[PDB]
Amino acid sequence: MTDLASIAREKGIEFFLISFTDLLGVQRAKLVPARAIADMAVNGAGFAGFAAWLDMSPADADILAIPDPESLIQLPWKPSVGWLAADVHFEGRPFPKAPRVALKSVLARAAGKDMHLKHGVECEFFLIQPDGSAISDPADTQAKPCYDQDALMRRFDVIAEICSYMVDLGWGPYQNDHEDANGQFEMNWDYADALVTADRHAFFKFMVKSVAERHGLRATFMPKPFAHLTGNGCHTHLSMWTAAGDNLFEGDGELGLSPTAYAFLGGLIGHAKGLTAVVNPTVNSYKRLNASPNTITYGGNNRTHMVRIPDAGRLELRLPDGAANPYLMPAAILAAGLDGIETQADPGQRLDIDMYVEGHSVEAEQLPLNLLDAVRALEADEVLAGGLGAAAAAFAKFKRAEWADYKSQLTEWERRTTLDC
Amino acid sequence: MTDLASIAREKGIEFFLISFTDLLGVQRAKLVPARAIADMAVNGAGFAGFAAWLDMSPADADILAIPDPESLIQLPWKPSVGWLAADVHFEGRPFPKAPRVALKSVLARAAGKDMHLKHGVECEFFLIQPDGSAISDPADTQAKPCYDQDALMRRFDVIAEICSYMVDLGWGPYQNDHEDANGQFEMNWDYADALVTADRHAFFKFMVKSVAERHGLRATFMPKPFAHLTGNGCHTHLSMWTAAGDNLFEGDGELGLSPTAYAFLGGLIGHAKGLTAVVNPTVNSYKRLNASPNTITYGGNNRTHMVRIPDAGRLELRLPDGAANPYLMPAAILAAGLDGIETQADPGQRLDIDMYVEGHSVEAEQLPLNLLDAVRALEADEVLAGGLGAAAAAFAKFKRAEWADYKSQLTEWERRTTLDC
Amino acid sequence: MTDLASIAREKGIEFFLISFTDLLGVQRAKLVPARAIADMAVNGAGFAGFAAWLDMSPADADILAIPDPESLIQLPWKPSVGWLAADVHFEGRPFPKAPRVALKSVLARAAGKDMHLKHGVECEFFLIQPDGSAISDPADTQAKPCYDQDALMRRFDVIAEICSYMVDLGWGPYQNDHEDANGQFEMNWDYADALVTADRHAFFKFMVKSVAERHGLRATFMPKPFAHLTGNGCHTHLSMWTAAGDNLFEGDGELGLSPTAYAFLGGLIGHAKGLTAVVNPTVNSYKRLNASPNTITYGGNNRTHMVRIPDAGRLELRLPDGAANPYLMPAAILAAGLDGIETQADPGQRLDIDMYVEGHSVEAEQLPLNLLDAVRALEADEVLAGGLGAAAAAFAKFKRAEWADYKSQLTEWERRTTLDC
Numbered sequence A, B, C: 001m002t003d004l005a006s007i008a009r010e011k012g013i014e015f016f017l018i019s020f021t022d023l024l025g026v027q028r029a030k031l032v033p034a035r036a037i038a039d040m041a042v043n044g045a046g047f048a049g050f051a052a053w054l055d056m057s058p059a060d061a062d063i064l065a066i067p068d069p070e071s072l073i074q075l076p077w078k079p080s081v082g083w084l085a086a087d088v089h090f091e092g093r094p095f096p097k098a099p100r101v102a103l104k105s106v107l108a109r110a111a112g113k114d115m116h117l118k119h120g121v122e123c124e125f126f127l128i129q130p131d132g133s134a135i136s137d138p139a140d141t142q143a144k145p146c147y148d149q150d151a152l153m154r155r156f157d158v159i160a161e162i163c164s165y166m167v168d169l170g171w172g173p174y175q176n177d178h179e180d181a182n183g184q185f186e187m188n189w190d191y192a193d194a195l196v197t198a199d200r201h202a203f204f205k206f207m208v209k210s211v212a213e214r215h216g217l218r219a220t221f222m223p224k225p226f227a228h229l230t231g232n233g234c235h236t237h238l239s240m241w242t243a244a245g246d247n248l249f250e251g252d253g254e255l256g257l258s259p260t261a262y263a264f265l266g267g268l269i270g271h272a273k274g275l276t277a278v279v280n281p282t283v284n285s286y287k288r289l290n291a292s293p294n295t296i297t298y299g300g301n302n303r304t305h306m307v308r309i310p311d312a313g314r315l316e317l318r319l320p321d322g323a324a325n326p327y328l329m330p331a332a333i334l335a336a337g338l339d340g341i342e343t344q345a346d347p348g349q350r351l352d353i354d355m356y357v358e359g360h361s362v363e364a365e366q367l368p369l370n371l372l373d374a375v376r377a378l379e380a381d382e383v384l385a386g387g388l389g390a391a392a393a394a395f396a397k398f399k400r401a402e403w404a405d406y407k408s409q410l411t412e413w414e415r416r417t418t419l420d421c
């Protein structure tokens, strides 16, 4: 790996965006001219951490975001700018409250046991009007819009541009779909080592929002952006691999899954409640859990349970939504899963039923149904909090304030239903 | 007591409003011509209970609301109509889920022990525009509007009319004030036997709303109707009396209070959390508990604690808000208090401090901070649920549905704070 | 077979639209980058079938749409994209509820008797404003607009573009007409093997809609889109052929038709009622049957009957409308016809009269006059239902639901005519 300064000269990069993800998933970046990249690659870009979602004080020394040169992406729509993901450092060490640092820590524990997490994300999003008031396509109106050829091709320019970028970047994109809400789309690409996928997922949201804007549109990954439409998931596909390239999840047990997979699964099931706080991290998230289908079960090739087993050597957690932190969520999933493996956790019986029809009759534990309860579940889950380190309590702090902020709002519903009390 | 038919002939009453209060405090009434009052006074007015907030089925027999002839009030603004409060009966017996029946049951238990609850209510309300969008007086704007002579006299017509009605009805009204929010008023009258006060409180809200409408205005008892203004309380004054006319609360202990009073108080303190669900019964209610001042303490002549001791032989519960059921709330207070007396409950130390300044430093139990948590507190409080009978679980059911209804609403705050997640 | 990956390289195709038609005729497609076509061509593109009109559950495994490489069409207006028609497979076999699969089944039965159905379609459509409120040409206004030269040429650019595409695609287009309603047009091309014509029919609607949109206009195949104008037919021309290449309908009987042709006709007459549900598949469809001409008769070179004999070796079914599924329609027609042939059905006497003038005096069976009755007829016709397989029952299920949805709408007619009852 050559230096970024030399790459800048060779590939015509004039500015670098040195970037990191805070606790709320917000992309924080600094635009640095190429003349300054050498110093910053080694010493890091200085940011006042208290000004981001990092649970820091104005009295603290500036954090130093150290770029991972392997993450470099020349913006495909603006190649004279080089994007870099970074680890936030504080007082000479990675700062445990930064999502990407948290993720790297859990990975290092799994890696030490020769277990390498790989995942793929299904990042649904909506294409909407710039003012956010409606979807971008007024002609996308029918009751079952999923895979609608007409509406898909009406947004060919934006979708095709983005997919072609992903081809060039080497993500191995393989399908673009219109999803089951009007105005909603999904663009899939190959799974990879968790850190690779996490970096891609963070960049992907930024690319989609950016390219949409250039087309006079807007993209949102909001969990439930419209009252009358279903929402955005981020269903996650999970497998564990040895450094020698074998999928520990492949086995001769049920459905081609191994004991390791089922123990991992058992951690997922066992830690589902606190896990919800992290993978459904906003007040808005909880609308998708109250629509009925809010219990903890799996699985099989069945898109009706919290966990689906799509094929051999693979689990799909169907819990995370569009707001899920690209680093915190694989981190939290891995912590729960690793615990499952170590404790030989038992997932219980696979249910081969349609939960939307027969779910009412199944005795199952229930997920937390609002942000506050979910945070409480996270705080009571010591194994999970310990797996995320200091990030967990900082996350719980912020979400509790969001909760109180939300509840303090005077809504129309309140006035409509209470004015005559 | 003569018959209502004979009174109708003598006082020129052409219609009776036979009325009862459901679990949400909603006044349900039927307008019956005088020719039919005799049968209904004895047999009751038939209502389909499932259509009110009574937790009933369409398959149930109609309830029979039996008028309390002693409650009769010729509408002062329309004397040809006679208003009556009623006990809802079902299958030949008072229906334990009806608020007024619940209240009468608790009273009968206290009465059996020669303890007679008397209370006064401070029913603050706002005078607002008919469309509810702003207060009725655009010139009522200053930062400290409390007792504002100008704004008070600007609403003299409406206030004076209502107070004069209360004089004629024999309620012993003694003061009308502009309260500490712009547009907010209060009109006090003498305390009385709980059932008398409860009937008056129910009628009072109706009279104020009715008279406001006749003046082209509107009244609301909503807890927190405006984002920028403080809200409506219903602080309640409480004492217990023997049939021989002695105030059991008067004594030689601290502040002129007796051991009975302090044990009653101890029930209040001891049952405060579940009590909150009943006396802060709406989602909206909880805004007033998050503004800081949400802990459980008393007292002294100090408007800064959950309980104030204004004078000898008197407790003021400063907890209830404008949405409090006129029957359920004295009922719930009495259940908690009676328990305190029977268990010789200990309130702990009176705090002679200003909670708004030093509250942060006091170790005290905290009230529930949202409707859901408050309902949970009610459900966990067996003594309190048992004291209200079947009304308690029916109340909890409805409020839980209100909670889920509220949370399902897509708010602007959500879109503003999450669209860019 | 030069593979799709190879064809993509040489033809410069960057994306494929893998498409299938659902039970409501809706085009469902996935946009796949060339780099992924090889795998999808072999294994199929995955779709959640419950999200389309296929009568499935979210608990079902995804269907796999397997593309027919012989259907490949480079979109003539956007040749970097390659459209493919696909067969829906479920759990390792063709999904009988998918129209194209159902059609292929019926064709295989017939093929097994050396009878190969060939058909051509007259897919009338309107050109309208994007908002759908009026036709595209405000100057197209005369009482008898059929074949209007001015209006035809006023839309030359769009019509000519589409026709030239059909020339290049090898469909053998031969005429473009302005039809007998203002704003209505028709573009004819050579008949072919049923499956070829079906795929083309499906693609054609998409082409016309897409090209219209590129010209700032819009196309609709809605059966009756305007209250004041006549509607869109999809009249179908039908013949049966041996593999040797002879037209089984050509014979010595009347009008140059054979006994086989007449028995086929007899199946059409015999199953006309049930057939109506499939080829008039919407509530809106039934307007064209209540506008008189709704009895079951043929024929001769006479456009006044349900079936017309245009010439030797050919039958024209004048029943299907613009909403007819391009796959279900020929399938249902073939099912009926084959039965006619197997049972030696007697079509009755040819009526050489004008049904518009003398039709009232003829004794003939009447077609069903609304969607509900038509569905009932489909369900009662077990020979027809059995011939379409599971597609029939799923179709009827959806249509019964559409019917209930329609009836549940509060129409202005209802209010105008009932408000004063």
Ligand SMILES: Nc1ncnc2c1ncn2[C@@H]1O[C@H](COP(=O)(O)OP(=O)(O)O)[C@@H](O)[C@H]1O
Pocket (backbone or CB within 6 Å): A118, A119, A120, A121, A188, A189, A190, A191, A237, A238, A239, A310, A313, A314, C046, C062
């Ligand atoms: N063994 C695996 N481990 C982790 N992720 C995987 C694995 N296999 C596939 N994926 C990823 O899961 C995501 C979804 O894949 P997909 O084949 O579309 O699943 P499905 O057919 O169930 O919808 C993709 O990003 C994909 O690359």
Ligand SMILES: Nc1ncnc2c1ncn2[C@@H]1O[C@H](COP(=O)(O)OP(=O)(O)O)[C@@H](O)[C@H]1O
Pocket (backbone or CB within 6 Å): B118, B119, B120, B121, B188, B189, B190, B191, B237, B238, B239, B310, B313, B314
């Ligand atoms: N001994 C009592 N028991 C119950 N309520 C009382 C008692 N004495 C007064 N009240 C009532 O309490 C309410 C408030 O009285 P008020 O004298 O204005 O109290 P404060 O001075 O503390 O504001 C009135 O309705 C009043 O009649």
Ligand SMILES: Nc1ncnc2c1ncn2[C@@H]1O[C@H](COP(=O)(O)OP(=O)(O)O)[C@@H](O)[C@H]1O
Pocket (backbone or CB within 6 Å): C118, C119, C120, C121, C122, C188, C189, C190, C191, C192, C237, C238, C239, C310, C313, C314
């Ligand atoms: N023998 C046949 N079998 C099936 N379809 C046919 C046959 N001959 C013609 N067609 C198709 O029927 C459609 C109508 O043909 P056309 O010549 O316009 O007849 P008409 O003048 O009666 O409308 C055309 O699309 C044509 O391809």
